[PDB]
Each structure stands twice: as structure tokens, then as C-alpha cells.
């Protein structure tokens, strides 16, 4: 079959290792990374490093083991001052940096030959939203289309991720002090605002906004609510096109953040390979049964106390 | 608190014609008069009489934002107005001045309702509130032993866009973005009913005298007929493509005159829908309509649109149109609808509702030039200015007239040399000037407290009639006056009470 | 020009900005409405986390754009 390899923690690099494992178990991402050969053979970038690391795991002799990703981490630290330290970081911020950094590399390669084409990062992860804003005096609709690499969805207690996605695409009323400046009415009026998925991504990365700022008390907390994520997820658009989309997605990876608060903690990825589930905790690789995954929904009770909780979910379009 | 800002308006002293659309209309049968509620903040009085070159009688100017609804009452003596400036104002309708300002609403006041028999008025708006007003109490100038309490209806779960009462004041209803109609008995202030039906916002309500039957016009496109007694929709009328905003009914309560976003006005037999008379296609969406009620065959209907002209369309004939040309037309003026600020942060280019183009000096507070229908984006690039000046004012086109606003956070950001401003500065060689300071001084020039033992900034003056406004940021208006009248005693007194400290420092204490 | 930010609870606020405004300017305007200090803020738009030194025109952010506001879970 395949190779199952932990990654060594170097200081506090679990934010990075956890995300690598998710991304490595996103087959389409993995394959395109293995296939990467530079247009300019000369010089070393964050992608060449990811690519060397991924070959290394993929061409390893035994089925299970541990790699120290010295060379990727070193390059990460060289590229980005925010990660040039041994302090704990946010996994989602790293995922965003990584994907965009690669995308920028590949875009430079395309341009390089010719001496607004999309890179395979965008191919795998990009979707598109349509935002509609309906002015309530004049009743005009303004539509703006905005790409995304993931959706950052707000959460609430004892709900599913599917309900959260619903919440995300509901009609909000802009009013009171949030009135819409309408160019027809040349004035601020109340508005209906809705963001709908216009185009589904091959892989849907969900970022659970597990934070709450207390305006009074000048700091934020971590939300350890029960937010349930199903193994299969169904998404769709409504009418208005040649084609209506109604697509199943399968859960392939969860990046879980462990701890009771936002300013410190630990990261672990759970992933699906060949229809069973593994847990990667830096160097440790451990196989768990599907029901163990419910620990990561979050806590029904003792919400202040320490939690292990899903934070980034990768859903793969069924294939 | 909120921050207090200073504004002025670039305009002629008298604006005879509406400079934006008109949201509401009232007829005094007795005096042959039409009141129009402006979106240019101004309420106007017209005579509806034979071939007068000006039907203009007068402007009632107090409001700082759109006037959204007007009610006429006590035999045409008093007018009540609701505005987007969050105030309900009480006016002497005969004389045309403001008696009182009511400040109970916390958001745009959208609608008014009149129970003629009880001389009762109700206001509602975006703050989801409804207040009940005894007009004779509001206009009584007598000292009263009663402390002047208000009563409020409660219930609405979001913003209210229409409101109605019957002649008796038996019942009152509101239309809000939450789709339901909600029903109260005014004199009790108690909830009777909640009516489900519409799928969108409802902006138009009418009731019969009895308070047994209601019509509602909705953005969902449906007109509806309700039985208050039965608490159920009994008919639903699909006469328009897009939302219905304006309804009138006939004296009998058998025909409904409906209007909206799709510019087409239909009389419609309630008893049998199929017969519908397409009256007219207006040039713009219909905001409100007012029936002439001389005759039981109601002769004419006055129609308010997003345009500044107002038309009366005759109903003399009673799906091509009945009429193609306005029976009577009240002239409108142009709204300025586009504004570009150049990088020098002194000059404005505008394009108006007549595709006309103009070049304006913000600091000197005046038009520089008329450019008469040139290509507008070309003109922006044609007059590009390669200077960096920081931003120090914002522009507001809600009224159709240019409103310039000065806020503390950046009123003084812009420092510029006198030569670059284009000032003579004859003596020696020129210095740093701060445009915010210079303008504030020009605005408050006549105010005695500015003078130090020379008047203003020295370099220039504003048009003496430039209205100057002090107001809270997206909140209530503290005071307004004309630049030249700050030299009056009562005016000076009000300036002391309202001009905020930050303006004081520059204008009277002479700081930087 | 007016843009939107979708905040931590889902609620959308409006911001008045100019194309030449830096992302730092923007986060200060967020702070005014929301209390959240610029250094704890991250803004995502068009799939990119926006960099403090850059401007809204650098990202082609235009009227009615929605920025997504997120904080961090460190680990
Ligand atoms: Zn509008």
C-alpha cells in the first residue's frame, strides 16, 4: 500500500507538522507536489522543500517511521519572520501562508517562460462566492464575486458544521450603524446581504472560528463548543446557470487544536487513508477507530476546561 | 457621547424646486395646496391652481436628511414630518415654520399615521419603535400641569417601513421587513393581531374608516386585502412585476391605485381583479401617490417618484395607458449624483441628474465652472492633479446638494502653501496654511467670539447664505444657521451651547 | 468607499476606506468598531492573508468587498 510517517517537532513546530500531514493526505495536493519539477532548475524555494519532504515520505523503505523536516523548517524560518522563532503559531495562518506561497512560486514559473492563469493550488482549493447586497429603499441588487481558498465559518454551541455553513450563507441585514452606502440612493440605507457559494472547490477547507473577544475585558477566549463534523458532507448551489451543482464531499483530514485557551496549546491532524483513520501527533502515528473522532467535536460541558477540538477540516469532493 | 461634526451646503439661498426625489405628498383641499416631502430635506408648499407660472408658495426648511413622510392635520393648520435625521417635526402649516422637534426615535423615521377623528398621529421607523402623538397637545402653547409623557407600541422584531391608522383610531398597523403586519388598538396600546402573508417587506398601508379591512402593498409584488375581524388575508393581487410601494384607495373602498419599482400605475377593482386600468408609465419608480378627492369619481392622482418633478395624472377616463402626458407638472431641479475629489483636496467634479458636469471649490465653498454634459471620466483624467494633500473633509450627496462635512479626526490634516492655494499673499513671501482651519474660520466669521482685539481668515469668504450645520456623527443635529446670521444675539448664544471644543480652539482661541 | 468585514460572531460591519489605506489603517478602523487590537487581527480576502504594509489597492479591494476577520489558536 503506502507510507505512514510522523514529523519531528523542532521547538514548537506542531502548527506546521499538523498541516503538512493534512495536506499530504489530500491526494490531489500530494500528487501535484510529487509531480513538481522546477522550470528553473537553479534555486531553492518553499515548494522545492515541500516537494523534497513529500518524496522522502513517499519513497521511504519501511511502512511506518519518523522524519525530521529540518530542511523545510529551515526554509520556512528563512522566508517568514513570523515563523522565525520557537513560539507557538496558528495552524490556519500557516496553511494560508503555505498555499499562497506555493501559488506565488508556480505563477512566477508561468510568467517566467513568456519572458490570468491559475496554478494547481487554486485548482484544488479555490472556490468562488457571490455576495449579493440588496438595498432596502431602492431594491437594487449588487453582486460581487470573491474567490476563496477556504471558508472561515463562525460557530455556535451544539451544532453541526453543516449548520455553520448554513449560518455563513444566510441573509444578514445591514442596519443600525452598519447601513449600506447605496450608489442609487446616494445615502446609507438598510440592506440584505447574502454570500452564496457560486463555485465549489475540489477540496473544501473549513476553518472553524473558535474565538470570542471580550470587549470589556480586553482579551479573547477559545471556544470549545461541540461542533460536529460528519464524515460525508453535501453541498450545492440554487438555480441560475447551464448546470446545477449538488456534490458529496468526504472528510479526509481534521487539524485539531488541543488546549483550553487561544494563546498556547498543541496541534494534531487526524486523516483518512484507505477507509480507516490515523492520528498524527508530530513523531507519533497511531490508528484510531472512527468513533474516536467524536472527541474532536468539542465539549458539551466544562467549556472553560481543556479541550481537543477540530479547527481545520478538509473535505474532498467525492471522486 | 458621539463626536460632533461641522457641515455646510453649497447651494443657492432659495431652492424653489426639489433637488432630489420626493417621498410623500399631502393635499389641503380647503386652500388648494400640495405639500411635497423632499429627499433634499426640504418640505414645499404649492398651489394646485390654474396656469400659475410658479405654483411655488414656500419652502419649509428644518430637516437635515430625507423627509420620509408628511401628515396634514387640524384642518390644514399643522404639518407633522418624519425624517432620516431621526426626528419628527411639528410645523405650523399655514405660516410654514417649525414649532417643535421630537427626538424619541433612535434611527430613521420612516412612516406616519393619522387618525383624523382623534387628532392622533403615530410615527415609526428603523429603530423598531412606534410612538403615539396627540397633535393638540403637540401644538398647544399653553402651560400644562400634566408632565408631557409619551406612549409607545412594542412588538416589531425588525425595522418598520409603513404605518397606518383608521379615521376613528380604532386600530393601527405597521409594515416591517419581518414580513408580517402587526396590529394594535391605539387607545389601549394592546396587540390584537399578527398577520402572516407577504414574503418580503411591505411599504404601503391603507385602512377603511371602520378598521375592519386593510390593504397592503409589498416589495414581494403582491397587493393584499385583509379582514381584521376575520384575522386572515382574503384577497391577493398580482398587478406589478416588481415591488409595490404606493397605494391609494377610492372613497368607497372598492378600487386600489397601486405603484412601485416597475413605474406603472394601476387602478384595480377589488371586487373583480381582471378589469385593471393601466393609468400611466412614469419615468421613474413610484414612491408615493396622492388622490385628489374633490369628486367620488376621484378626478386626478398626484405621483411622487425618485425624480424631482411631480406629476398629476388625470383619471378623467374611467393594457395600453390611459394617459401619456402629465395633466399638471411641478418643476423639479437636478440632483448631484457623482462626486470626484481631486488629489489637491480642494476641487470637486460633479455629474448631475441631467448628465451636466461642474467644477467646484470646496475651500471657497462655491461653484468655479459649468461644463455642460462633457464625458465625465475623461474630465476626471483631463483635470488630474499631481499633488499629495491628505484628506480633510467628506462629501455627502444624500440631499442632491453638495454637503461637505468636517470631522475632528482629520479636519486639520491638510497643510498647504498660500501660493499653491492661489492666494495673492502680497506681503513678502508666503507661508503654511491649514485648509480646515481656514474654512472653519470662514464659516464662523460673523460670530463675534472669533474676533480678537480683523475678521475671519482674511484670505476669503464663503457665500454669506451658506448654511452651516453642527451635528453628531450619524446622529442628531445640534444646530443650524446661515453663515451670515452668526452675528445675531440668539444665534451667538446657540453657538456657545453647540459649537464643540475642537472648533473653538481654532476659531476663537486662534490655535493650530 | 465602503467595504465590509465579517467578524467573529458572523456579524458584518461596514468600514469607510480609501484604496490607498494600508491594511494597518483598516485594522485600526476595525478596532474602533470591535475593540480588537490590530496586532491580534488577521484579515482574509480572495484567499490571502493581508499584510500590514500593503494597501487595499495592492489587493484590488473595491467597494462592497468582504474581508473575513479571524484571530489565532496558537499551538
Ligand atoms: Zn438603494
UniProtKB/Swiss-Prot annotation, chain A:
Activated by interaction with WDR20, WDR48 and DMWD through different allosteric mechanisms. Changing residue 228 to D: Impaired binding to WDR20. Impaired binding to DMWD. Does not promote relocation to the plasma membrane in presence of WDR20. It is an enzyme of class 3 (hydrolase). It catalyses: Thiol-dependent hydrolysis of ester, thioester, amide, peptide and isopeptide bonds formed by the C-terminal Gly of ubiquitin (a 76-residue protein attached to proteins as an intracellular targeting signal). Zn(2+) binds at residues 135, 138, 182, 185. Its EC number is 3.4.19.12. This is Ubiquitin carboxyl-terminal hydrolase 12. Changing residue 189 to A: Impaired binding to WDR48. PROSITE patterns: USP_1, USP_2, USP_3. Changing residue 190 to A: Impaired binding to WDR48. Residues 5-318 form the USP domain. Signal peptide: none annotated. One of its GO terms (cellular component) is cytosol. Knockdown of USP12 increases Akt activation. Belongs to the peptidase C19 family. USP12/USP46 subfamily. Its main location: nucleus. SUPFAM superfamilies: Cysteine proteinases. One of its GO terms (molecular function) is cysteine-type deubiquitinase activity.
From Swiss-Prot, chain B:
GO terms for cellular component: cytoplasm; cytosol; intracellular membrane-bounded organelle; late endosome; lysosome; nucleoplasm; nucleus. The keyword rRNA processing does not apply. Ubiquitous. Changing residue 203 to E: Strongly reduces interaction with USP12 or USP46 and abolishes stimulation of their enzyme activity. Changing residue 159 to Y: Strongly reduces interaction with USP46 and abolishes stimulation of USP46 enzyme activity. Changing residue 150 to A: In UAF1(11A); impaired DNA-binding. In UAF1(11A); does not affect ability to promote USP1-mediated deubiquitination of FANCD2 and stimulate RAD51-mediated homologous recombination, because of DNA-binding mediated by RAD51AP1. Changing residue 108 to A: Impaired binding to USP12. The modification Phosphotyrosine is found at residue 17. Keywords: Acetylation, Cytoplasm, DNA damage, DNA repair, DNA-binding, Endosome, Host-virus interaction, Lysosome, Nucleus, Phosphoprotein, Repeat, Ubl conjugation pathway, WD repeat. Its main location: nucleus. The keyword Nucleus applies. It comes from the Eukaryota. GO terms for biological process: DNA damage response; double-strand break repair via homologous recombination; embryonic organ development; homeostasis of number of cells; multicellular organism growth; positive regulation of double-strand break repair via homologous recombination; positive regulation of epithelial cell proliferation; positive regulation of receptor signaling pathway via JAK-STAT. Changing residue 307 to A: In UAF1(11A); impaired DNA-binding. In UAF1(11A); does not affect ability to promote USP1-mediated deubiquitination of FANCD2 and stimulate RAD51-mediated homologous recombination, because of DNA-binding mediated by RAD51AP1. Changing residue 161 to A: Impaired binding to USP12. The modification N6-acetyllysine is found at residue 203. Belongs to the WD repeat WDR48 family. N-terminal WD region interacts with TIP and C-terminal region mediates lysosomal localization. The WD repeats are required for the interaction with deubiquitinating enzymes USP1, USP12 and USP46. Knockdown of WDR48 increases Akt activation. It comes from Homo sapiens (Human).
UniProtKB/Swiss-Prot annotation, chain C:
The modification (Microbial infection) ADP-ribosylthreonine is found at residue 66. Phosphorylated at Ser-65 by PINK1 during mitophagy. Phosphorylated ubiquitin specifically binds and activates parkin (PRKN), triggering mitophagy. Phosphorylation does not affect E1-mediated E2 charging of ubiquitin but affects discharging of E2 enzymes to form polyubiquitin chains. It also affects deubiquitination by deubiquitinase enzymes such as USP30. Mono-ADP-ribosylated at the C-terminus by PARP9, a component of the PPAR9-DTX3L complex. ADP-ribosylation requires processing by E1 and E2 enzymes and prevents ubiquitin conjugation to substrates such as histones. There is a cross-link at residues 6, 11, 27, 29, 33, 48, 63 (Glycyl lysine isopeptide (Lys-Gly) (interchain with G-Cter in ubiquitin)). The modification Phosphoserine is found at residue 65. Changing residue 65 to D: Phosphomimetic mutant that binds and activates PRKN. The record marks 68 as: Essential for function. It is a peripheral membrane protein. The record marks 54, 72 as: Interacts with activating enzyme. Residues 1-75 form the Ubiquitin-like domain. It is found in: Cytoplasm; Nucleus; Mitochondrion outer membrane. Exists either covalently attached to another protein, or free (unanchored). When covalently bound, it is conjugated to target proteins via an isopeptide bond either as a monomer (monoubiquitin), a polymer linked via different Lys residues of the ubiquitin (polyubiquitin chains) or a linear polymer linked via the initiator Met of the ubiquitin (linear polyubiquitin chains). This is Ubiquitin. The gene is UBB.
